[PDB]
């Protein structure tokens, strides 16, 4: 996206916003027993590890929009995907505010711990002041919605997380844009029935994987994505590279389903505060707020359709099976397509597509080497039809080496075990032994391989 406006906060009647500058990340008890090189992302200009201007390296996410327009192919992609989603018969009416706050079927309750955004972050007001979870009373919230209204600036926080070592000195730390609670509630109100239907129906009709459980969903993917050709590739800066035309296209699908097609352009043309600067961006999807993962998935469905259409012009879209989780996508067609040919068609829209898993060349894929949500695919030993989701061993080793809270170590390690065992008993037994070499790991419950495997069979 492109920065259209940039102003000092004191010149437009706004205050400075103060965002956490120190990491909660700390070496854990397993730091010296597992290998790794990730460190907490730089969170401030004064970090001694920096070797670059911090504010410039963050604002490089925004480097212009390519000159392009709607075409017939994007248009047929819109009509095809729309007719597919109509199959679901989503209720276009808004949901009650009670359901937006405390949830309903397919819509998780609002997180009451994260920031409430502008203006509440400057007023000493948190979410639990607006919403009482004990009584389910939202009277304070309703007054704050009336008083402050909607379409408020997003606060851009810096994501406190582990990063590869080369991204530390280069000041390459991710930005998340926490929208106001006022606006998250508006988006849930308008689009809540769509969000619910997607979460409850991950697969090839929504074209979306949000709300899936990889443990059981992995077995279904080969059934859904039939056709001789399994395809996947990676995007460079997906969120930032999405031109305004893809929001018009998304607006058109929402309109075909009788949903508000306009609220969406507040994501496209967005307003922000970072520290002491107010700024506005045209293009790009704000990373980390209202319906982000679903809207990105829907947009990816449009892109993949139009890109295949641009590269090949006797295509049958009924046979182009797609599953997307935001920027991450896997798809199939009834016969072999050239992924390089399809990727090249992205350039004219301002999309940058490289081969999957940081590969050198665009090569053919099968389920033996394809990745989705960081995971590979491996047939079970006894039942070859059940597919293990395979989480990278390296990412588990780096994760275990750090904590944000030592008290919740039992939960942290158990989560890692549930990921790890899918890579096989040999790698899992090595994992267990290293954990039990220190006395803090001796104190934990570490599930045996056989109980994990038996528990998994029973989830199906």
Q: For position 406, which CATH number holds? A: 1.20.960.20
Of the candidates 326, 317, 359, 190, the one whose C-alpha atom is nearest the C-alpha of residue 258 is 190
Does 27 reside within a domain?
no
Verify that 330 and 436 share a domain, yes or no: no
Does 41 reside within a domain?
no
424/389 Cα distance (integer angstroms): 11
In 227-328, alpha helices (H): 238-241, 244-256, 265-268, 292-311
Q: Which helix (H) or strand (E) holds 91?
A: none
Does 137 reside within a domain?
yes
- Report the residue count for the chain: 460
Strand partners, 235: 353
115/44 Cα distance (integer angstroms): 19
Domain boundary among the residues 339, 366, 393 is at 366
Q: Are 88 and 321 in contact (CB under 8 A)?
A: no
Verify that 432 and 356 share a domain, yes or no: no
Spell out where 187-274 has E strands: 229-235, 269-274
User: Could you tell me the two tokens for 246?
Assistant: 């893809």
Strand duo 321-325 + 269-274: pairing: unpaired
359/357 Cα distance (integer angstroms): 5
Long-range Cβ contact pairs of 430-437 (< 8 A, separation 24 or more):
431/396, 434/30, 434/33, 434/34, 435/30, 437/33
Of the candidates 184, 177, 173, 185, the one whose C-alpha atom is nearest the C-alpha of residue 273 is 177
Domain boundary among the residues 330, 345, 366 is at 366
Does 42 reside within a domain?
no
Q: Are 283 and 244 in contact (CB under 8 A)?
A: yes
Say whether 137 counts as a known binding-site residue: no
Name the structure determination technique. X-ray
Does 32 reside within a domain?
no
Does 399 reside within a domain?
yes
Q: Are 74 and 248 in contact (CB under 8 A)?
A: no
Say whether 234 counts as a known binding-site residue: yes
- In the block, residue with structure tokens 């991450």: 328
Domain boundary among the residues 337, 366, 395 is at 366
Of the candidates 330, 326, 235, 328, the one whose C-alpha atom is nearest the C-alpha of residue 286 is 326
Verify that 381 and 256 share a domain, yes or no: no
379/389 Cα distance (integer angstroms): 9
CB atoms within 10 A of CB 450: 10
Verify that 331 and 219 share a domain, yes or no: yes
Domain count of the chain? 3
Question: 392 lies in which domain range?
Answer: 374-460
Does 351 reside within a domain?
yes
Helix/strand/coil percentages in the chain, nearest 5: 40, 15, 45
Question: What SS3 state is found at 236?
Answer: coil
Angle subtended by helix axes 244-256 and 72-86, to nearest 10: 40
Verify that 108 and 223 share a domain, yes or no: no
Does 18 reside within a domain?
no
191/46 Cα distance (integer angstroms): 41
Q: Are 110 and 100 in contact (CB under 8 A)?
A: yes
Q: Are 290 and 192 in contact (CB under 8 A)?
A: no
Q: Are 253 and 85 in contact (CB under 8 A)?
A: yes
Verify that 236 and 158 share a domain, yes or no: no
Q: Which helix (H) or strand (E) holds 403?
A: strand 402-403
Verify that 298 and 406 share a domain, yes or no: no
User: Could you tell me the two tokens for 193?
Assistant: 């029935």
Strand duo 162-163 + 39-40: pairing: antiparallel
């Amino acid at each position: 996206g492109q920065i259209q406006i940039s102003k000092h906060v004191k010149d437009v009647g706004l205050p400075s916003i103060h965002t956490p500058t120190k990491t909660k990340l700390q070496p854990s008890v397993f730091y010296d027993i597992f290998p790794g090189s990730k460190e907490p992302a730089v969170l401030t200009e004064k970090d001694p590890r920096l070797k670059v201007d911090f504010d410039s390296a963050l604002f490089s996410k925004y480097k212009g929009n390519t000159e392009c327009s709607l075409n017939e192919h994007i248009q047929v992609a819109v009509a095809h995907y729309s007719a597919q989603l109509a199959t679901l018969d989503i209720d276009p009416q808004p949901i009650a505010m009670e359901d937006s706050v405390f949830g309903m079927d397919g819509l998780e309750a609002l997180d009451l711990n994260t920031s409430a955004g502008y203006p509440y972050v400057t007023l000493g007001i948190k979410k639990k002041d607006l919403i009482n979870n004990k009584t389910k009373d939202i009277s304070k919230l309703k007054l704050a919605l009336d008083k402050y209204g909607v379409d408020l600036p997003m606060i851009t926080f810096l994501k406190d997380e582990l990063r590869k070592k080369d991204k530390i000195a280069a000041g390459k730390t991710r930005v998340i844009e926490a929208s106001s609670i006022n606006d998250t509630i508006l988006f849930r109100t308008v689009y809540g029935n769509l969000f619910s239907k997607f979460h409850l129906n991950p697969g090839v009709v929504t074209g979306c994987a949000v709300g899936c459980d990889p443990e059981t969903f992995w077995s279904k993917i080969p059934l859904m994505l039939d056709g001789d050709c399994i395809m996947a590739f990676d995007y460079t800066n997906y969120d930032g590279s999405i031109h305004p035309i893809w929001f018009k296209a998304l607006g058109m699908v929402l309109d075909n389903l009788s949903f508000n097609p306009t609220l969406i352009n507040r994501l496209c043309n967005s307003k922000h505060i970072f520290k002491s600067t107010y700024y506005e961006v045209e293009g790009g999807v704000p990373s980390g707020c209202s319906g982000t993962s679903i809207f990105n998935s829907m947009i990816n469905n449009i892109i993949i359709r139009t890109l295949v259409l641009d590269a090949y012009k006797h295509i049958d879209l009924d046979k182009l099976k797609i599953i997307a989780y935001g920027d991450d996508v896997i798809f199939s067609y009834k016969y072999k397509l050239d992924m390089e040919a399809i990727a090249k068609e992205g350039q004219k829209y301002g999309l940058t597509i490289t081969p999957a898993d940081k590969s050198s060349e665009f090569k053919e894929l099968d389920y033996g080497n394809v990745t989705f949500l960081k995971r590979g695919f491996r047939q079970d030993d006894k039942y070859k039809f059940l597919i293990h989701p395979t989480f990278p061993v390296e990412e588990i080793y780096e994760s275990i080496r750090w904590t944000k809270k030592p008290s919740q170590m039992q939960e942290h390690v158990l989560s890692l075990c549930h990921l790890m065992w899918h890579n096989g008993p040999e790698i899992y037994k090595d994992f267990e032994t290293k954990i039990r070499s220190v006395s803090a790991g001796r104190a934990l419950y570490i599930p045996p391989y056989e109980l994990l495997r038996h528990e998994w069979y029973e989830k199906f």
